[PDB]
């Protein structure tokens, strides 16, 4: 049952989505991630655009530096093992829960607006015989139903834009425990520049989302019991991901968006890890 109309619009969107630029990538190695790349890009192994399997090769090099953003965020959650919680706030189809089941062998708790999505990601569990550690759920990630400080270390990959953040550091700090760990990528818009530019307009516009600013993130942060220990402007790391990207056919029209509003200083990709203290 919807929160808010808010949330009700955001449970649609992604009961509706199925794009092929996100699709064609999970089934690279059936990791179905719905966030953006870092990193170099590896010229090697896409060979000579004129190829004829170049597009092919273009898929499982996006797909590889989304995989490396993902573990890029894992290590920054400090030490985590069986008898410990991982929570995936916002957690899409699961790739990422996948991921850190087999990185920490932790259990794994992911939380989704949709439906379609938590299907498809508990599907994915059980295939893969980890459904007894890895788990998502339709809930809304402001108010979960895990115990107070049960939580070892939690995360928002991409998803902090559909939330106040007050409303969503508060819950994290709820269920995570004393010296329990969290870390954010997000894009945020740059205080520096001082207010959304047209850019970062036509990206909430795209995915009906709320970016927030940077100095909002941190300012909720230090509000809430979260302190950062690690920030990382991960901009000119993405950009490579995004130049790549907007050469392939699977491009969604947002690409320029991104690329200019990144370049212009109007609009970043970060990553915030703090402690719960
Ligand atoms: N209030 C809320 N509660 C739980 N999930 C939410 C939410 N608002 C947005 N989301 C989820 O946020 C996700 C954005 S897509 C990012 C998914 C995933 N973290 C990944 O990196 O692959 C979607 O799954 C959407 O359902
Ligand atoms: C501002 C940032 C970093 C993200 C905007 C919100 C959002 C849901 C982006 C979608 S990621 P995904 O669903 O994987 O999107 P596409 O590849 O289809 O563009
Ligand atoms: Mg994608």
């Not at 979960?144 to 819950?171: C, I, Q, R």
Request: with cysteine; aromatic share 10%.
């Amino acid at each position: 049952a919807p929160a808010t109309p808010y949330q009700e619009d955001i449970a649609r969107y992604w009961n509706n989505e199925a794009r092929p630029v996100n699709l064609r990538l999970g089934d690279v190695d059936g990791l179905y991630h719905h966030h953006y790349g870092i990193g170099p890009v590896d010229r090697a192994a896409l060979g000579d655009p004129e190829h004829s399997e170049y597009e092919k090769k273009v898929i499982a090099e996006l797909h590889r530096l989304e995989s490396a953003q993902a573990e890029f965020l894992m290590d920054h959650l400090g030490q985590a093992g069986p008898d410990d919680t991982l929570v995936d706030a916002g957690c899409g189809r699961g790739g990422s829960m996948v991921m850190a089941h087999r990185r920490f062998g932790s259990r794994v708790e992911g939380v989704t607006l949709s439906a379609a999505q938590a299907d498809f990601g508990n599907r994915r569990a059980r295939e893969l015989r980890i459904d007894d550690h890895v788990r998502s759920r339709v809930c809304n990630m402001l108010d979960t139903p895990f115990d107070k400080g049960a939580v070892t270390a939690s995360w928002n990959n991409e998803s902090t834009m559909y939330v106040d953040l007050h409303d969503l550091f508060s819950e994290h700090s709820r269920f995570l425990k004393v010296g329990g760990r969290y870390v954010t990528i997000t894009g945020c818009w740059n205080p520096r520049y001082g207010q959304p530019s047209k850019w970062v307009s036509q990206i909430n516009a795209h995915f009906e989302c709320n970016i927030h600013s940077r100095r909002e993130y941190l300012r909720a942060m230090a509000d809430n019991r979260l302190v950062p220990h690690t920030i990382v402007d991960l901009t000119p790391d993405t950009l490579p991901y995004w130049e790549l990207r907007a050469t392939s056919s699977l491009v969604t029209g947002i690409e320029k968006a991104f690329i200019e509003s990144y370049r212009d200083g109007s609009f970043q990709y970060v990553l915030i890890a703090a402690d719960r203290v």
